[PDB]
Amino acid sequence: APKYTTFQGSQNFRLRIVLATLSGKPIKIEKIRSGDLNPGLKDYEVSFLRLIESVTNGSVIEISYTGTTVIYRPGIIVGGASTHICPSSKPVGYFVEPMLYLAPFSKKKFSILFKGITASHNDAGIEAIKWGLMPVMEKFGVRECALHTLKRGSPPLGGGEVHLVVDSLIAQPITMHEIDRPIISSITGVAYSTRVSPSLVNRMIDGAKKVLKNLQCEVNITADVWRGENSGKSPGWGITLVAQSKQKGWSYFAEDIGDAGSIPEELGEKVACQLLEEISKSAAVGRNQLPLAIVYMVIGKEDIGRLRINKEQIDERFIILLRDIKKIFNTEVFLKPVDEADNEDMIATIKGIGFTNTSKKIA
Amino acid sequence: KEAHKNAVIAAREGKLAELAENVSGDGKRAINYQILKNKGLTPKRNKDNRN
Amino acid sequence: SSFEKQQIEIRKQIEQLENEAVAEKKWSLKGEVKAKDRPEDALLTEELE
Amino acid sequence: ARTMQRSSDVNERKLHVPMVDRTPEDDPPPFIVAVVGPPGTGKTTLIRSLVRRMTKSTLNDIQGPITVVSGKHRRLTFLECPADDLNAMIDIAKIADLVLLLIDGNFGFEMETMEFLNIAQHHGMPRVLGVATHLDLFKSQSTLRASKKRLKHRFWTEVYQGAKLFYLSGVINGRYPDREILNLSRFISVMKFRPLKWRNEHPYMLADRFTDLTHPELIETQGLQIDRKVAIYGYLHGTPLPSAPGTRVHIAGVGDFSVAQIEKLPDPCPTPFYQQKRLDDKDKLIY
Amino acid sequence: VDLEKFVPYFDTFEKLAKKWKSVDAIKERFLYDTWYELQKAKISKQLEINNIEYQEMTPEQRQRIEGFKAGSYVRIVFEKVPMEFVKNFNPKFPIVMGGLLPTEIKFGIVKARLRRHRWHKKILKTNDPLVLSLGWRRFQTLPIYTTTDSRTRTRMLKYTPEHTYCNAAFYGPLCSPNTPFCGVQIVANSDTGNGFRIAATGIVEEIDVNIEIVKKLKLVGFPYKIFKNTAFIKDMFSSAMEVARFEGAQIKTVSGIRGEIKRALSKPEGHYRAAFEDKILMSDIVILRSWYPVRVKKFYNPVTSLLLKEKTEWKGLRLTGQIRAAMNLETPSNPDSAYHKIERVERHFN
Amino acid sequence: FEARQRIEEKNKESSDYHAKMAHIVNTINTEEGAEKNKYERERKLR
Amino acid sequence: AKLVHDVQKKQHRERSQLTSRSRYGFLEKHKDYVKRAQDFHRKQSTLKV
Amino acid sequence: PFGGSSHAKGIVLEKLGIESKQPNSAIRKCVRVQLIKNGKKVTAFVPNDGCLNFVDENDEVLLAGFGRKGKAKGDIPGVRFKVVKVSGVSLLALWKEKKEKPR
RNA sequence: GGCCCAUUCGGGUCUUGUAAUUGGAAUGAGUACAAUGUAAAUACCUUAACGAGGAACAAUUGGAGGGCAAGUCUGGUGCCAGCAGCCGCGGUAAUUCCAGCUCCAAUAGCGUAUAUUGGAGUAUGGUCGCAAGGCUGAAACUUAAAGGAA
């Protein structure tokens, strides 16, 4: 009897599949969308499962006929070069984001070429993955990671291509100690426009600078206009803002795209205000950057790692994150309050499981 | 044909018989000369250089 | 006993492998082969580089 | 000058690979002292002599591990390796910290000794101290010293150079002489141990006591053939073993099992340092 | 709330801009002798940080997070232990319990460099069983000894090289790479004898779930009608369809003359036309080099010596020579394969 | 068809192997020879 | 031979003509082929002149 | 070459040129070693392909100077060091089969 | 036939070669009896009896140079060149094979590493920087008047 670890619900599907892949334990995810109008897996979820089968080897993924049951027995992470065509329901970021968890621990390097819609409202954008998540991987030890935008495709027609290359095959992430709050050196950003007039980027930049002129820090937002065949099919625009710490190296980001029939200055002010909200709610990492750091301190070596998190940062998705991690890795995060009474911050201490990269060939 | 087969199998069991005689009847498994001297992989050397 | 049963299937596998080790090589595991040594039209079924 | 160049060279010798110890400084486990030899060398009498010297108690029957408070802060788990089982030799070579390697001085080296040395070398090298017995069987003193030097040189070829090959004269009253056992215990006390990679990565445990918890009524109802529930008592070595049940372990020679229950127990052979300059007779304990 | 929704929750834009018209909320944030001693200092710093955190945690949660620390006397209760262990328990034989890292539970194909031991007399044979002591486990398996044809493939070897390391592949429990191991042919005191018992030593380079090992396949043909640079070749194939799949292939002569398969002859069926760089001889043999996949046998026989009553004289799969002597069969010999003394006359020409 | 595919793949593999080996040898030569030249300049100075 | 074992320099023995092909005579190798080809090329060069 | 010492100690980082096809080339024999006292990464020669099996990753090695007497045809100039010992046992004795690696 | 010199052409010289067989003699290491020795013992001195043909009673350490395959890799202006080759096709009681390939030097000694008694011009699949490309207006538009070419 394999004695599958059983999960319920379509929540955290990618997280459960990836954590099963890293821990090597077989899982059974049951009753996903059991009573709905259209029960079963979504097409983008089946595409993600095919992506996992593509990047791994010797992994048995079983889907029931009804689609309400997934049986996953993980295998060796092998990597390699491949091309993945994302469906129209989801952008490329929905498939790129789980690969950052699996990337440094493969037998061969990830060089994956994703084709589909580049940006959307609910998922990660290219600038988001490049400048928010990859600095955290670099801090945990991934020296060489890169994401090239060959083509950029806005919704709904799509037509963009993005290339993910991870050249740092490490044994295990380093133990992390970030008790102190970082201080932000500057604010940068990218305001991009595809297949639309090139004044919208300047208009968004003026709208964002309207909000951020009060800051004493320098605000530099680059104008990225895509011309030609690289522009993709359907028209769109959008801005991504990242605030960077020069000394420590952390980065806090917000992003959005413009929907049909909206003024660019309103989008610029919205993105600037969401950036400031993330600085206010964030202590050391963003709420969107947090699962990367938590899983990395979990899979680090058997040492205590400390990462300061914020009173607002503890919330529902963090709770279900910690519960899934405790279900799979049997790891509990001890939470210690910071002795400073000025701000209610809490140190998260995680003992690493001692995970190591056994896929890499020593020779 | 079967006479040839008996001849060759007789030769083989004879060789194993001399091996079974060559192994010692004493309980103690003594070290052999190669393990004792630990000469290693050496070239052929002239007898003139011994003296 | 469970261990006794596992010993039974292990002995079964051992005896099968003994027959496989004694038995003659396949024509493709033979080093040099002619058409007389092969079965007829084998190279159409098998793929070789 | 020449002294400075020699200082640079010995500094280069003192340089070593940095590596994490993973050893508890507060309550370290006893060091596994494994007595390995050909079938007639004197392992049982050597363990008798060492236990007689350390805990002041003689043991008529020696079997399984023996835990002994050797010094103030050191305990030794003596295990006499069965001479006729290569699987036993493999398990001992994987778990042993100090290996007392018994060589019959009169007969010379044996294949069992050489096999154990090579297994230990390939898996992970423990600290090896040689003990040469049966030197009383020699008739001539010149032949005795010549065989002594021959054994020492071959032993130095096998083990690292400078490893001690202790010499035991002979049994007087069914045990080895007290001064020789005193010097041997001094050598064991002054030895220093370095952590090996496999033992620093995996948790392991040499079983001190084995017991059966299955219900005899259950046995009577379903016959003798059923699987038995088994409790195993011992000192934990290596990395910490997880507190939650379900941890997967391999028992060398039995198979793979998952831990169903685990509990800490008070120490049966505690050190006098944790109890609290010369070691006391009340402090010398045996388990 | 799903973590599939990468963008976190936010309030309305109007309320957000009304709250963030001011900026005073976040104004506070904006504004050794040797390398060896340095590494030891970093290790000691991490160890003392671990000690301080474990100290400041409560002891119950300390036990939960750390686990049972080494040097702790523990009782561990197992279920499903086999009956023969308790029945034949002998206190002299040790009991060793070692925890398994997650990789070591898995079973797959282990690739390892391996050499025949110096004091072991005979070489080892491909698909001939060997008891490996890898990790905590000892288990009998069938390895395949391979080579790289100057780093171009993994080609099967019939035997281990004497005095040399070779790549080997076997089925068993996976282990972490860079793990050393030993291999012994016999563990039975009825079989020991005077010989040195340790047969192989090695270290694990790579683990995988499959491997592609090839064995060389030479297709052998003969010339029956030879011209200048063109020959008609026989006995390589059995039909023109077989020829037509292999048309355009490199072939060569035992002399060394290179050529190409060109067309299939109509009659008789197996014959074909070939073009060479020189005139060949009726004494020549034409060879075509191809490669055939070899599958690693999946045999896992653990050494459960403690469950036995004797606790020695453990038996497993036998060596091929032992099986041949047991079933009274003769070693397979090829008359053309034997080496003979070759005498050449002086080569004259008209 | 299979013949054309095999020939193209083998040509690409051989060219990539040659490029990789030349890159390794050139980097080793440049950096290590620079260090060797600096040390020899130091020795001829002293 | 600075760093070569004497077991690396073993003699690889030459294989003979097959007994079914013994009617055709001696099995040529590269050493025989070179003599044959050199003789032909010398004859053809002087014939060309 | 090394600071004030005839020999140095290092940790083997990787073996360069094991994916090269030609046996006993200098690229086949190159090994990258990080010296203990400085952390500098230098390339050394393993004497033979036979000793390259004995050299493994993360072992401690003892490096001496290489010292070419004449310019060989296929050598790599620039590599200045050679591996003398590994794991406290000399590579020549391991190659000549007089010793086994302690690990 | 062996050897010596010499860029080659060549020249100088003369009981040499043999992994061929065979004969008895010698004795040291050792094994070991005694006495001597000394409070006693060791050791020393003396010392009967045994103690060699693979004299297996089994000397090392370094250097130089080959040669071999139905074997492998790389580059090509057929048959070549280079790097090399414990890996060949069968076979491990299986095979007696360049017979264990030849030669050199020191010898219970013998190696390694480190320390010490410029002019002129090529090559560069390394690093860094600069590039190079498109009729312009003209792109999200095949889109005007002008040109630019023609």
Ligand SMILES: Nc1nc2c(ncn2[C@@H]2O[C@H](COP(=O)(O)OP(=O)(O)OP(=O)(O)O)[C@@H](O)[C@H]2O)c(=O)[nH]1
């Ligand atoms: N003469 C002499 N006999 C010794 C010496 N050492 C041990 N013995 C003999 O060894 C015998 C005891 O055997 P054991 O104590 O069991 O030795 P062992 O090697 O552990 O043997 P097993 O336990 O049976 O495997 C005694 O009767 C002694 O005669 C010694 O130094 N001199």
